[PDB]
Amino acid sequence: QFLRTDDEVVLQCSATVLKEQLKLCLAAEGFGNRLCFLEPTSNAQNVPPNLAICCFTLEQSLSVRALQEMLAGHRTLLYGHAILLRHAHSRMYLSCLTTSRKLAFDVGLQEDATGEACWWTMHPASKQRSEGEKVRVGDDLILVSVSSERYLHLSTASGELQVDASFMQTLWNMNPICSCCEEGYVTGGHVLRLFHGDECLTISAADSDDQRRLVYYEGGAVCTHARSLWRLEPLRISWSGSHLRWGQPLRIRHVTTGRYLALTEDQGLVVVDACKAHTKATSFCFRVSKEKLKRDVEGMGPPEIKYGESLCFVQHVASGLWLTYAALKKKAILHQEGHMDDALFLTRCQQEESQAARMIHSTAGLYNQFIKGLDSFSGKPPALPIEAVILSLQDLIGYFEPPSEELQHEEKQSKLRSLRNRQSLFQEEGMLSLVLNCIDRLNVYTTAAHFAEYAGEEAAESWKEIVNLLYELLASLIRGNR
């Protein structure tokens, strides 16, 4: 009922697009794009809303007297406090930038929580709440950027909906996503692996004849590759990050591919594009048993499903079909009766791995777009994402860059081991081919001006930069780091 620090929230506002009141959350991508945007949560039944990129962690809520004192646990948020919001998807911080794209600033992300620019003071939106009172869940509120002293505010100019820091006010809901959970219990929004018996649930490797659409039970090294990672996403906006319960409908999202576990009329059990991932075809639940078989709480809920200790049957909700094998690599199928040994156990994946999986997804998406733009004009003299591609390239280069040679051996090796594991994950997801395709397609052009003939000078102004960054990323992915 009250928001404590280390709680997870989405900042939600309202707008009336196409003459109807749509609610939508504050979103940021992170790498490749620092600028914030808005994610519609409204059309949940037909399209899975991208809540993952909307979650922020309430890192700290301080009195201005302690906030000014800093620049030299489980506290409840009080009105008047300045808060620090950590973007969960990127581990970056919600900040008020010094760019503008009409007196206003851009709202986005800071790589590090530095200075006043990443702090926002909370203020009551009504005579019901007062300065010093605890901020209550589902309260409308006003947020003021400490550095600029402007309001976090949604724009409607001209056609599209944006976010900026303006002298205009916007009323913002803090929807709780999650709070303290019971140790070792599965909660929504968790990225995990579903094990069988070793064998785990996965899609095929990159570039497979599959088009990566089919689901498998596979053993060996997959259990340590990103392709076997899934996010459990319940059919809720608020307390989506609550404990999961037996029978609770949920979507199962494949992380790197972005597609959703689904039952199809034609294909059968497959993974499916986000836009085509409707509730009926996409809703699964965890069952204690296969026997015949309530109303969701406004909180973390009762802890029901335990990591590694709970054997779970997976069931498609609409059809009642069981996730089973077909009969080391087996096709996963949905079946009426299934197999006596269909029960999976869930192992929570760790952060370094989960982050890398999500980073793969963004980068694949951004670069596939960049390639599509290149392919669009091959032989023809569709705006290319130059700005983002450059930033993405730069970001991954720093991500992969080896430790400073003048560092202690104990830490150097440990930081080196992770770098290697981080590189491996990307490598096994065909990130090298991705970088190579971008290089090969850019190399079809001899001079920067030759590229300008098919793309224009503005785009060509960064041609030698993108190739140098791509070759640099390539090298950084390849480097042994032993």
Curated annotation (Swiss-Prot):
User: Which family is it part of?
Assistant: Belongs to the ryanodine receptor (TC 1.A.3.1) family. RYR1 subfamily.
Q: Which residues of the full protein are shown?
A: 12 to 534 of 5037
What is the source species? Oryctolagus cuniculus (Rabbit)
Subunit organization:
Homotetramer. Can also form heterotetramers with RYR2. Identified in a complex composed of RYR1, PDE4D, PKA, FKBP1A and protein phosphatase 1 (PP1). Repeated very high-level exercise decreases interaction with PDE4D and protein phosphatase 1 (PP1). Interacts with CALM; CALM with bound calcium inhibits the RYR1 channel activity. Interacts with S100A1. Interacts with FKBP1A; this stabilizes the closed conformation of the channel. Interacts with CACNA1S; interaction with CACNA1S is important for activation of the RYR1 channel. Interacts with CACNB1.
The free-text domain note is: The calcium release channel activity resides in the C-terminal region while the remaining part of the protein constitutes the 'foot' structure spanning the junctional gap between the sarcoplasmic reticulum (SR) and the T-tubule. Pore opening is mediated via the cytoplasmic calcium-binding domains that mediate a small rotation of the channel-forming transmembrane regions that then leads to channel opening.
- In UniProt terms, what function does this protein have? Cytosolic calcium-activated calcium channel that mediates the release of Ca(2+) from the sarcoplasmic reticulum into the cytosol and thereby plays a key role in triggering muscle contraction following depolarization of T-tubules. Repeated very high-level exercise increases the open probability of the channel and leads to Ca(2+) leaking into the cytoplasm. Can also mediate the release of Ca(2+) from intracellular stores in neurons, and may thereby promote prolonged Ca(2+) signaling in the brain. Required for normal embryonic development of muscle fibers and skeletal muscle.
Q: What else is known?
A: Binding of [3H]ryanodine indicates that the heterozygous channel is activated by Ca(2+) concentrations 4-fold lower than normal. Single-cell analysis of cotransfected cells shows a significantly increased resting cytoplasmic Ca(2+) level and a significantly reduced luminal Ca(2+) level.
The entry's comment on post-translational modification says: The N-terminus is blocked.
Kindly provide the name given to this protein in its UniProt entry. Ryanodine receptor 1
Q: What are the MIR domain coordinates in residue numbering?
A: 74-125, 132-177, 183-235, 241-300, 302-350
